[PDB]
């Protein structure tokens, strides 16, 4: 339609996202964009190959790291309440690492990538005596606080605490609290027999069906599958645009604490000031797996409106990204049931985001 900005948008997804699909033999895709306060969803190709089955506005998608964001949310949720303090040690709120390396991590550390774990879970640790053992005798290569290294280990303690501080099991706290409050009855850590026709496969690099296999600690690492729609509701709700501890808490989420390289490290979301440069978003989203030096910002940088926020997450089946610019109310959301390179999620985001 001729002066209306819908079709415009849809030209400039379509025109970015169909050779992307095409050149990296993704299945399929939803891309879904909010401006001006409306929302837009473009679904593309295939949500399974065999039997074949279509991306659809109820199709549920990993976002494996995305999930990293709603433990946050969680322990924010619980700082607003009066639950939890950041600066208190891991210790502190487990008793049973009291007299270990935990004594001297905050739960910040473990909620900011700063307190020194690795990026993976070690493969034999299955249930919870062997995840204590190791948490007992693990020892920093540097302090806490002094170097920023993504961990999985990490965000699993940070979403384990702010669930013991609530009362509940982490998997009650999400589901039963945090996204209920949130409007996102199609996001879930267990997808019910109802909804798992609309269950995504994802395709991995030897182009084989997969789906993630849930293992300790990983629904607060990896665990979240969600509508590309609920997510935007999600970014809108960061964004302060729906309809008060739960406002408090999706914004707290965006304060700087950390410094290192191009980017400020929030509470597991991450930022860059805005307007942002393509270059140092890409340097900004290539800090997966390397350690790199982290300065503290004290006092810590409030909640920004001219910042640009965003998180990538990835499965061996699925690619996920969310950017927004809360000073100009806008967002994306990108998922895909093929893990594809993050330099070419966040070049279309950039692409997307600047063309409105």
């Given at each position: 339609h001729a002066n209306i900005d819908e079709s415009k948008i849809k030209d400039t997804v379509d025109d970015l996202?169909?050779?992307?699909?095409?050149?990296?033999?993704?299945?399929?895709?939803?891309?879904?964009?909010?401006?001006?306060?409306?929302?837009?969803?473009?679904?593309?190709?295939?949500?399974?190959?065999?039997?074949?089955?279509?991306?659809?506005?109820?199709?549920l998608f990993e976002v494996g790291s995305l999930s990293k964001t709603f433990a946050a949310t969680l322990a924010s949720y619980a700082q607003v309440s009066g639950k939890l303090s950041l600066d208190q040690s891991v210790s502190h709120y487990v008793p049973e690492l009291r007299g270990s390396s935990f004594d001297h991590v905050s739960v910040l550390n473990v909620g900011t990538h700063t307190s020194g774990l690795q990026l993976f879970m070690p493969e034999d640790i299955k249930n919870t005596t062997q995840l204590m053992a190791y948490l007992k005798a693990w020892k920093p290569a540097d302090a806490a606080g002094t170097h920023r290294v993504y961990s999985n280990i990490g965000t699993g303690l940070l979403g384990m605490i702010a669930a013991k501080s609530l009362g509940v099991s982490y998997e009650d706290a999400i589901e039963k609290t945090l996204l209920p409050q949130l409007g996102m009855h199609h996001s879930y850590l267990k997808v019910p027999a109802d909804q798992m026709e609309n269950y995504a496969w994802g395709y991995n690099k030897?182009?084989?069906?997969?789906?993630?296999?849930?293992?300790?600690?990983?629904?607060?690492?990896?665990?979240?599958?969600?509508?590309?729609?609920?997510?935007?509701?999600?970014?809108?709700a960061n964004m302060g645009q729906?309809?008060?501890?739960?406002?408090?808490?999706?914004?707290?989420?965006?304060?700087?604490?950390?410094?290192?390289?191009?980017?400020?490290?929030?509470?597991?979301?991450?930022?860059?000031?805005?307007?942002?440069?393509?270059?140092?978003?890409?340097?900004?989203?290539?800090?997966?797996?390397?350690?790199?030096?982290?300065?503290?910002?004290?006092?810590?940088?409030?909640?920004?409106?001219?910042?640009?926020?965003?998180?990538?997450?990835?499965?061996?089946?699925?690619?996920?990204?969310?950017?927004?610019?809360?000073?100009?109310?806008?967002?994306?959301?990108?998922?895909?049931?093929?893990?594809?390179?993050?330099?070419?999620?966040?070049?279309?985001?950039?692409?997307?985001?600047?063309?409105?």
């Open positions: 996202i169909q050779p992307l699909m095409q050149k990296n033999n993704i299945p399929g895709m939803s891309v879904a964009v909010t401006v001006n306060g409306k929302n837009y969803i473009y679904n593309y190709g295939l949500a399974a190959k065999q039997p074949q089955q279509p991306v659809t506005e109820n199709t030897k182009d084989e069906p997969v789906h993630v296999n849930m293992e300790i600690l990983g629904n607060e690492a990896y665990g979240i599958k969600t509508t590309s729609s609920d997510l935007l509701r999600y970014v809108q729906l309809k008060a501890k739960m406002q408090q808490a999706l914004t707290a989420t965006h304060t700087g604490y950390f410094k290192s390289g191009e980017i400020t490290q929030d509470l597991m979301w991450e930022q860059l000031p805005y307007p942002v440069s393509l270059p140092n978003l890409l340097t900004g989203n290539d800090m997966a797996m390397t350690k790199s030096v982290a300065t503290p910002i004290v006092p810590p940088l409030p909640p920004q409106e001219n910042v640009w926020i965003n998180k990538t997450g990835s499965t061996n089946g699925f690619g996920a990204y969310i950017a927004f610019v809360p000073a100009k109310k806008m967002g994306i959301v990108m998922l895909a049931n093929k893990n594809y390179s993050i330099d070419q999620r966040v070049t279309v985001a950039y692409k997307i985001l600047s063309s409105l």
